[model samples]
Target: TIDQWLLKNAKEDAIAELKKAGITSDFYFNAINKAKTVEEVNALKNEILKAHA
Candidate 1:
């Protein structure tokens, strides 16, 4: 359950990023739940992080 794992572990920063990425409230959590692997979750997180830079 990477989605649950990610939401549980997410800092507020990631929540903001998710919104910026056009994912609605709580949508990123659902998105991560569909990830096939931890790598996918990490990539999604990284993409959000990079978008801010």
Candidate 2:
């Protein structure tokens, strides 16, 4: 439940980053829906990081 954890712990900067990257709540929902394992989730996170950077 990393996504849930993230949402719970999200700082203003982090939330802004998500919005700046065009990642909506639906994007997180989609990613979680598509991820079948922890590795997949990690990969998705990496992709988001790259996008943010």
Candidate 3:
């Protein structure tokens, strides 16, 4: 159940960080939806951080 754990944790962290950055709403929903893999989700998160930096 590593995939499930990875997906859940990745999503939880992504949502939390997004909210912390004031990126609420549905704007990031698609990215979340498209995240079929943990790497995809983590990459998206890195992109967000890069954007903010």
In the range 1-53, model 1's lDDT, one tens digit per residue, is 54565433444445556667665544455555455556665456665446434
Q: Local error of candidate 2 at 30, Å?
A: 3.8
lDDT of 2: 0.51
Candidate 2: stretches off by over 4 Å: 1-25
Report the alpha-carbon TM-score of model 3 versus the true structure. Answer: 0.56
User: How many backbone clashes can be found in candidate 1?
Assistant: 0
1-53: candidate 2 lDDT, tens digit per residue: 56664333333424445557666665553564366555555455556656444
Which segments of model 1 are wrong by more than 4 Å?
A: 1-24, 50-53
Query: What stretches of model 3 exceed 4 Å from their correct place?
Result: 1-6, 48-53
Candidate 1 global CA lDDT score:
0.53
Reference-based TM-score, model 1: 0.37
lDDT of each: 0.53, 0.51, 0.66
Residue 6 shift from truth in candidate 2, angstroms? 19
Give per-residue lDDT, candidate 2, residue 31. 62
